[PDB]
Design a protein around this ligand. Structure first.
Ligand code: HEM
Ligand SMILES: *[C@@H]1O[C@H](CO)[C@@H](O[C@@H]2O[C@H](CO)[C@@H](O[C@H]3O[C@H](CO)[C@@H](O)[C@H](O)[C@@H]3O)[C@H](O)[C@H]2NC(C)=O)[C@H](O)[C@H]1NC(C)=O
Ligand SMILES: *[C@@H]1O[C@H](CO)[C@@H](O[C@@H]2O[C@H](CO)[C@@H](O[C@H]3O[C@H](CO)[C@@H](O)[C@H](O)[C@@H]3O)[C@H](O)[C@H]2NC(C)=O)[C@H](O)[C@H]1NC(C)=O
Ligand SMILES: *[C@@H]1O[C@H](CO)[C@@H](O[C@@H]2O[C@H](CO)[C@@H](O)[C@H](O)[C@H]2NC(C)=O)[C@H](O)[C@H]1NC(C)=O
Ligand SMILES: *[C@@H]1O[C@H](CO)[C@@H](O[C@@H]2O[C@H](CO)[C@@H](O)[C@H](O)[C@H]2NC(C)=O)[C@H](O)[C@H]1NC(C)=O
Ligand code: CA
Length: 595
């Protein structure tokens, strides 16, 4: 901060200041500083960027420049020695359902997205990088280790492109490079509605004035809605199966169809918007198309905030929750609501939470057909298994009945993601999310691990013995030291995730502080936080405390057996009750009488 006004990215428009509704962009939440928290602006910097040349070149770029005296280890080598494992047996989280992993990806995507630099639908630069592994400009490739099998089978590196930065897209002249966040920092359902003035509108159904979202017209799920297909060919969803030829879904957020289970979640959310809107027309027949939209929207936003803050964070943060996120005391206009750059890597802990397979279950929660369990890697940008395999009901029950993967210092990220990741731009299932995430810390100029322990007021080990004590693991601590040669050099993502878990939580002390602070701020900094006096009415608020993800399921699918607490592990049928029983969102507090 303070070279104070830079930035052409920015969409440019005006504030109402008495509108009961959030903008699409995030603008106007904060009154004296109207752009704070808007999409298309820099991620905040809780600490100064640390770049090889102090301005923009990442560490690992210039082969002979060290970090603190040592060579940073290769992204992919750190991946092979620390991150991978072979045996999926015993890896499941006994007390977290698959939906736990999945709500996290919804929340993260509502909060932050640093898109890659594209810079041309022309250049052998998406090819000069692909084919020849030549580092330069925005090509910053992940080279393979000696002894890496991928050498024999794939090539010399994995393509990787530096993330977008503020102000331009051309090589910028001067400050310190800052990455763009392309979405709104406020937990506002921007992943359903869009963060842009352009997209938000294209998503709506403006033929009927019922304030509905547009739905797929080419296909149905027992007369229930699917998302509209996305327009844009070439389509990666089309690529994974050229026979089925089913395109990716068009949603509020571009990553919606990265995986069948995430696309599933988006579908439930679109469905609740229309459900809520048609319900609202019923109650206020005079109500307008816009008002229908803004009011369903406003409710969906409150809903995501509630499930997130009431059900999800306490079982990520565990005992640390109340020390970072005290109870709400009212909107604080002085709090900086912006997502920080480090949060977007801290939140990546969810990557260790992803299991190797996905199941479809039938109405008795039994294996659905003969090819019921699928390897995760065949589900990246796979929409055809939704539309041409029985809809989302079978995946939705899998979400409740199956478990998340447990972070585990020895078994860290599944091969499904570490070896077989499919990237929407290239052809092979053969990318490493782990290495990527590492290459990306470096891309974003993150401070190393001891800077972050310092920031969160935690001890900073400087020796192997120091490291074992913190990590509580001799083996892991020595692998890290051999590779990094000083804890000060440990990339934050893997430093943060290597720590044992706090009591009742799913992240360690370092992560709980970083996650914790961000969430506190996005809630205290949000003028439209659902509990903020005057946003909803006391009576509306009373009716919103009854929302539950189980209800959401009941009202939007043909499942009639759900668990009451969806995020913990639940065995069918003992933990499964009748949909016909779960608290419903009483929706009458929203009535409007003009006399
Ligand atoms: C496939 C991928 C997932 C599941 C199979 C998956 C899941 C999650 C969860 C559950 C997260 C939070 C709990 C989460 C966090 C973040 N992700 Fe990740 N994710 C899959 C794939 C990807 C890919 C590919 C990326 C791009 C990484 C890059 O640097 O290019 C990715 C990103 C992120 C991310 C950063 C978002 C941003 O600010 O840009 C998380 C916080 N995920 N994932
Ligand atoms: C599996 O994980 C469960 C969910 O995290 C866990 O139970 C939860 O533990 C918290 C800890 O306090 C409790 O929270 C609430 O407890 C009482 C209800 O008895 C409330 O009156 C309090 O106000 C408080 O908020 C709950 O008891 C519970 N959360 C839920 C779902 O309500 C289980 O114990 C875990 N199982 C095992 C074996 O570890
Ligand atoms: C590309 O997608 C194809 C369809 O979207 C998919 O093929 C489909 O999957 C299986 C073949 O393994 C068949 O499922 C069953 O359907 C009939 C019922 O009408 C059964 O009687 C058959 O015996 C069969 O078991 C589908 O018929 C089939 N569809 C087509 C068009 O052939 C492919 O598997 C996908 N290819 C890849 C590599 O993913
Ligand atoms: C916009 O909304 C209208 C009204 O809901 C949709 O048209 C109706 O819904 C289906 C679509 O074929 C059928 O019941 C009727 O043809 C329509 N009924 C009415 C009351 O008009 C339409 O599908 C929506 N458009 C898009 C692209 O989502
Ligand atoms: C609103 O939140 C801000 C967030 O930065 C808090 O900042 C405080 O600043 C005041 C100075 O006016 C001091 O009390 C402290 O230096 C800060 N608090 C602490 C201990 O970090 C502030 O707490 C909040 N303000 C109000 C009025 O609620
Ligand atoms: Ca948002």
């Amino acid at each position: 901060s303070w070279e104070v006004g830079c930035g052409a990215p920015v969409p440019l428009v005006k504030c109402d200041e008495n509108s009961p509704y959030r903008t699409i962009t995030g603008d106007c939440n904060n009154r004296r500083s109207p752009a704070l928290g808007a999409a298309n602006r820099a991620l905040a910097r809780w600490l100064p960027a640390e770049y090889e040349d102090g301005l923009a070149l990442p560490f690992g770029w210039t082969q002979r420049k060290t970090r603190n005296g040592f060579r940073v280890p290769l992204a992919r080598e750190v991946s092979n020695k620390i991150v991978g494992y072979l045996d999926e047996e015993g890896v499941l989280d006994q007390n977290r359902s698959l939906l736990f992993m999945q709500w996290g990806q919804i929340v993260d995507h509502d909060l932050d997205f640093a898109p890659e630099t594209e810079l041309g639908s022309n250049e052998h630069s998406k090819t000069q990088c692909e084919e020849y592994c030549i580092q330069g400009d925005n090509c910053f490739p992940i080279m393979f280790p000696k002894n890496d099998p991928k050498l024999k089978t794939q090539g010399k590196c994995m393509p990787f492109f530096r993330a977008g930065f503020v102000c331009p897209t051309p090589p910028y002249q001067s400050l310190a490079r800052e990455q763009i966040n392309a979405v709104t920092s406020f937990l506002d359902a921007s992943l359903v509605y869009g963060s842009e003035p352009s997209l938000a509108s294209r998503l709506r159904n403006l033929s009927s004035p019922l304030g509905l979202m547009a739905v797929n017209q080419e296909a149905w799920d027992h007369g229930l809605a699917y998302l509209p297909f996305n327009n844009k060919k070439p389509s990666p969803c089309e690529f994974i199966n050229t026979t089925a030829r089913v395109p990716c879904f068009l949603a509020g957020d571009f990553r919606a169809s990265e995986q069948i289970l995430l696309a599933t979640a988006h579908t439930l959310l679109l469905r609740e918007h229309n459900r809520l809107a048609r319900e609202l027309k019923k109650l206020n027949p005079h109500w307008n198309g816009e008002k229908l939209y803004q009011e369903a929207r406003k409710i969906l936003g409150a809903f995501i905030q509630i499930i997130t803050f009431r059900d999800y964070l306490p079982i990520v943060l565990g005992s640390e929750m109340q020390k970072w996120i005290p109870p709400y005391q009212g909107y604080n206009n002085s709090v900086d609501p912006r997502i920080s750059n480090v949060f977007t890597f801290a939140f990546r802990f969810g990557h260790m939470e992803v299991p190797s397979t996905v199941s479809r279950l039938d109405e008795n929660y039994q294996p659905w057909g003969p090819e019921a369990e699928l390897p995760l890697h065949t589900l990246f940008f796979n929409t055809w298994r939704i539309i041409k395999d029985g809809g989302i009901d079978p995946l939705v029950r899998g979400l409740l009945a199956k478990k998340s993967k447990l972070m585990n210092q020895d078994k860290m990220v599944t091969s499904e993601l570490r070896n077989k990741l499919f990237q929407p731009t290239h052809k092979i299932h053969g990318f490493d999310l782990a290495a990527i995430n590492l290459q990306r810390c470096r891309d974003h100029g993150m401070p190393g691990y001891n800077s972050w322990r310092g920031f969160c007021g935690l001890s900073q080990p400087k020796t192997l013995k120091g490291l074992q004590t913190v990590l509580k693991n001799k083996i892991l601590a020595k692998k890290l030291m051999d590779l990094y040669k000083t804890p000060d050099n440990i990339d934050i993502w893997i430093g943060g995730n290597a720590e044992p878990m706090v009591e009742r939580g799913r992240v360690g002390p370092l992560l709980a502080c970083l996650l914790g602070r961000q969430f506190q701020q996005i809630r205290d900094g949000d003028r439209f936080w659902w509990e903020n006096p005057g946003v909803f009415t006391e009576k509306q608020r009373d009716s919103l405390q009854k929302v539950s993800f189980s209800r959401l399921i009941c009202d939007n699918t043909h499942i009639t057996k759900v668990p009451l607490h969806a995020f913990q592990a639940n065995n069918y049928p003992h933990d499964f009750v009748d949909c016909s029983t779960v608290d419903k969102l009483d929706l009458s507090p929203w009535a409007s009488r003009e006399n």
